[PDB]
Design a protein around this ligand. Structure first.
Ligand SMILES: Nc1ncnc2c1ncn2[C@@H]1O[C@H](COP(=O)(O)O)[C@@H](O)[C@H]1O
Ligand SMILES: [Mn+2]
Ligand SMILES: [Mn+2]
Ligand SMILES: [Zn+2]
Ligand SMILES: [Zn+2]
Length: 295
């Protein structure tokens, strides 16, 4: 699965290349998606103009970078909409809210069969700790796969953070912009191997598909979305978490919300440590080394 991180990118910027990419993605079971958009100077909620859509599936070891700007939304949608609409093909996102709004407003398509892995992580946190906070991809990759995420080129990130120019409008795109764009979908598809079809994961994939579908419905309405689904940008609607995931959990050792027993201070600090030999698990009064007359 760390093979996914070495998938090279192909730029899909012609009608011919688009048919080929579409043919390959049609054979997939899961497709990780992302959007790179023109930076908004204003810094309002919606993504700016779609520049690239990035796709990486379990059907081929490759990241497609669809140059929507060059192809035009019209040509892109003609060939991609049935695949986007096909609920039998899982679309994997990391925070789908804005991406879905953009697909709806700018391309006229609503994706079906969507799974939001940022929402998946929060659902796990809800189930175990009563935490409805959203985590960045870095934190999630670390916590779930033990991977330190290789950041993208700092020029790209800096240009974007300044917010005074579009950034993603230049053509051709330099190589380091393309490599930046390909980053997220590889991480998304990698991450889905740890979350989907894994019995160590305490939430059902279908419950998260159902929570994801609330986000798709809220954000794919053909127009800019005014009222947000979540109380603040960095969390997940608690009422939706109760509905699709169930009641929030907490620490089985001390009863408090916010942590599990493996992270409980009181559980670790409460365990017997031998004052004589140092080993956790017995007291001194039961220590074979301190008292050999117990052998
Ligand atoms: N630091 C940033 N400052 C401004 N816009 C950003 C920034 N990061 C991302 N964006 C915008 O959001 C899009 C999605 O980025 P990402 O969520 O990494 O896939 C980018 O293509 C930009 O349009
Ligand atoms: Mn994104
Ligand atoms: Mn991205
Ligand atoms: Zn505790
Ligand atoms: Zn001892």
């Amino acid at each position: 699965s760390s093979m996914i991180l070495k998938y090279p990118y192909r730029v899909v910027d012609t009608h011919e290349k688009l048919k080929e990419a579409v043919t390959s993605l049609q054979g997939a079971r899961s497709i990780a998606l992302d959007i790179e958009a023109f930076c908004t100077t204003d810094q309002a909620k919606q993504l700016g103009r779609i520049s690239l859509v990035q796709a990486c599936s379990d059907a081929k070891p490759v990241v497609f970078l669809f140059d929507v700007l060059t192809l035009t939304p019209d040509v892109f949608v003609k060939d991609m909409q049935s695949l986007l609409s096909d609920r039998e093909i899982r679309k994997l996102f990391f925070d789908c809210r804005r991406d879905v709004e953009a697909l709806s407003c700018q391309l006229g398509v609503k994706p079906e069969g969507v799974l939001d892995l940022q929402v998946f992580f929060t659902a796990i946190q809800w189930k175990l700790r009563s935490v409805n906070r959203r985590s960045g991809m870095g934190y999630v990759l670390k916590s779930v796969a033990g991977l330190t995420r290789q950041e993208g080129d700092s020029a790209v990130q800096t240009a974007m953070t300044l917010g005074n120019r579009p950034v993603w409008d230049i053509r051709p795109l330099p190589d380091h912009f393309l490599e930046y764009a390909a980053g997220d979908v590889r991480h998304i598809l990698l991450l889905s191997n740890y979350l989907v079809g894994n019995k160590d994961v305490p939430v059902d994939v279908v419950a998260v598909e159902r929570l994801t579908a609330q986000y798709v419905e809220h954000y794919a309405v053909g127009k800019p979305v005014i009222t947000e689904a979540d109380a603040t940008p960095a969390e997940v609607n608690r009422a939706w978490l109760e509905r699709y995931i169930g009641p929030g959990g907490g620490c089985h050792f001390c009863g408090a919300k916010g942590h599990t027993e493996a992270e409980c201070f009181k559980k670790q600090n409460g365990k017997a440590k031998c004052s004589f030999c140092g080993e956790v698990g017995h007291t001194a009064r039961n220590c074979f080394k301190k008292h050999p007359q117990l052998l």
